[PDB]
Ligand binder design. Sequence first.
Ligand code: HAS
Ligand code: HEM
Ligand SMILES: CCCCCCCCCO[C@@H]1O[C@H](CO)[C@@H](O)[C@H](O)[C@H]1O
Ligand code: CUA
Ligand SMILES: [Cu+2]
Lengths: 166, 557, 33
Amino acid sequence: DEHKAHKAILAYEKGWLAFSLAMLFVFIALIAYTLATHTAGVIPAGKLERVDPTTVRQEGPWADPAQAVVQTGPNQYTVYVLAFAFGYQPNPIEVPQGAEIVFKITSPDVIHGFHVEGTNINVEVLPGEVSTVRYTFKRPGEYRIICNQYCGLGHQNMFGTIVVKE
Amino acid sequence: SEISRVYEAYPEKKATLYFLVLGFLALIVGSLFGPFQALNYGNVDAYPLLKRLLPFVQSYYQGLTLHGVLNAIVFTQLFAQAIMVYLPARELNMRPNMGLMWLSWWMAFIGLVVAALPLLANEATVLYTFYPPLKGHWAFYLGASVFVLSTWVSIYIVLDLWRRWKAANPGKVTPLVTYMAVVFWLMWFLASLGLVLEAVLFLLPWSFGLVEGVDPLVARTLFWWTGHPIVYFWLLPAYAIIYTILPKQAGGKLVSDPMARLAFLLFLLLSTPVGFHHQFADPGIDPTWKMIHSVLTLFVAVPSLMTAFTVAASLEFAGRLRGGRGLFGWIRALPWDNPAFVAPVLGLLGFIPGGAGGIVNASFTLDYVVHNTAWVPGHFHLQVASLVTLTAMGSLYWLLPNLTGKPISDAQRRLGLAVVWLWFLGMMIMAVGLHWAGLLNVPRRAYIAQVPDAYPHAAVPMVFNVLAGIVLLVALLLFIYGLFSVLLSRERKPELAEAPLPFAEVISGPEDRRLVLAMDRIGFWFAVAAILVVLAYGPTLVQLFGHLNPVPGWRLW
Amino acid sequence: EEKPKGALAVILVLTLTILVFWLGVYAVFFARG
Ligand code: HAS
Ligand code: HEM
Ligand SMILES: CCCCCCCCCO[C@@H]1O[C@H](CO)[C@@H](O)[C@H](O)[C@H]1O
Ligand code: CUA
Ligand SMILES: [Cu+2]
């Protein structure tokens, strides 16, 4: 008693540890899996792409909202989005379902979130940097963009729209 | 000029009390905003009423800043400074350097006041994460800096206690509580460098006018270097108490000294090099490095997995000694009549759903589902707002008397149980509401009650948030009532202020020795922990600092 | 006395809860891919 319980516990402890680590490694495998699939496109680009937040809507790919969407591949469309103090440009964003949409988002003021309700697109938008994420819509419709990073008093009203054409 | 002979003999007792009281006052003020934040997520807008009561409040966001800052940063740090200095002191029966101890209290107090001014004045509504380009008043950054640096003095105090004890006990293994405290503070020192670097290199010169811009990516990369380990900084004081005091309150013993040392050692090693799990959705950070940090994060979960079994086993053991029946008999044998026992046990119950949430958030690609949604706040109220806070509240039943000599009537003990059950119950209901809403894409840090029709599909979970807000409001009110009924009475049995701390006995075995001896090579393990931080952050930080792109600040409130 | 049935029970619940959360969100991840 007490010294008997000591050995037992310490014994099942080692078992519990071996099991736990095993379950963790399985998770590590299932995560590796996702990184090999098409779903891993939502992982922000790793390379640094600097830009000036004070001249973003004056000169460059984000200057003219009309040239936001641009076919860069047979089925690839690059959308230059601009998340700003309480809104998204262009609004709405119009793209074709089934095509690989490569978003390149930046901000002219503070940090914003870019969360496309219904998808895995969830990337932070930083002033002076370009957030590059790839995604392929498989269902047409109006997907709503929600800002999930506090950016000021109008933050709760910062929404955007993406129209994937059938 | 000391009316208490007890305080002359044990001065650390007085400094500890000042840390505690300052900490709970902060907890009370910050918590006032909670119920309103819950109603808000319940789609109900009660702010005009709060605005009528607390006129200085200008918005949902200023209140959220006060909430996070006063609760997650101030209350938790002061509780840690009080516990991780006093417990090791009483265990070793050695006096901390008192000139330094009081100096650390004044730094925290002066730093808190200095920062509180701008906060209360709506000059820094940037949330407890204060992410640039959002620019707050210089007194906010200066106040926080001093407040946090208070901990560096705390670190020095305990290392000093430790060195002095080792000199008077040559060849003896560091006692358990002191061991936890030492690796705890050494971990914090390594962890705090991120924030110190952010404040010294960017934040402070930025708010003082020396520089006009700050690179957002490196600012948040440095922030999270400290950002994650700080929640372990919030947790371990609770863990020290759960491992070394709870078993005694339960009527049992800690079934393994070596296991508790190992858990804490793992924390010293793996707490800091995992910050990228707070940056999965960030650009400019290599995906491979994110995977690596994702892996080191799953490993940091190991210590808590061990803690779960060691503590559970100690509780079962205690339950048996009390006449524990079968597979669940030990559970009913425990002292559910003692709040010092119940508060932390409930905290551990909700910690299960809490840790599961964390493990999810830590799986790299899976974070894209819940990042910045109500799910995250759902996760952490189960961790810090419940486990840490309940353990702290519950420990008031043995700690408050031990420091003041003030007894606790049976009425206060029962009021305490009601407060504990409600807080726990309330937090659980809210966890369900926030997690549910999070899966429904409702964002966090949002005054959504102001846009009623923005989230219709979150109909039922909003109800749970309204219920939680009411339940917790009642619990909070009762806590205040009871806390002050204890600090405002004059009954004083000096003999109980002189009683020893209710430390639990520890069962030891034969194999302990050599394992315990290896873990006591603190200098070695410290260097190892430091090397991991250099390997997990060095490569990325070198590249960010070679391509800094600072941007202008903004005020959008 | 003997085997820690209660402790094992607790970590069993901890284990199952972790699986529901993980597998549950791992599913949603793909549903939104
Ligand atoms: C004290 C406070 C906190 C603790 C502890 C904590 C632990 C974890 N967290 Fe976390 N966390 C994340 C991952 C984890 C992981 C893997 C763990 C682990 O350390 C947890 C391990 C826990 C376990 C494996 C459970 C063990 C269970 C035990 C020990 C209880 C057993 C019960 C017993 C013994 C009683 C039985 C009683 C009877 C009567 C039978 C991630 C992602 O990787 C994010 C980013 C999310 C995002 O996208 O923004 C995150 C975000 C946060 C934020 C938001 C910060 C912000 O504002 O942006 C906060 C405040 C926070 C706090 C805390 N977090 N976390
Ligand atoms: C009366 C109990 C409490 C209630 C009802 C409550 C409620 C809430 C709610 C509804 C939110 C979400 C706010 C939003 O996303 O806009 C929140 C956030 C938060 N809470 Fe609490 N809370 C309580 C106690 C605590 C305690 C005790 C702590 C820490 C020790 C804490 C720390 C935090 C933190 C750090 C945040 C995040 C702030 C941010 O995102 O900037 N809360 N709380
Ligand atoms: C900015 C540096 C400030 C250094 C301040 C050093 C103060 C020295 C200690 O003062 C302490 O004050 C407590 C009340 O607060 C008294 O109860 C305690 O007996 C007294 O010793
Ligand atoms: Cu933009 Cu919140
Ligand atoms: Cu973390």
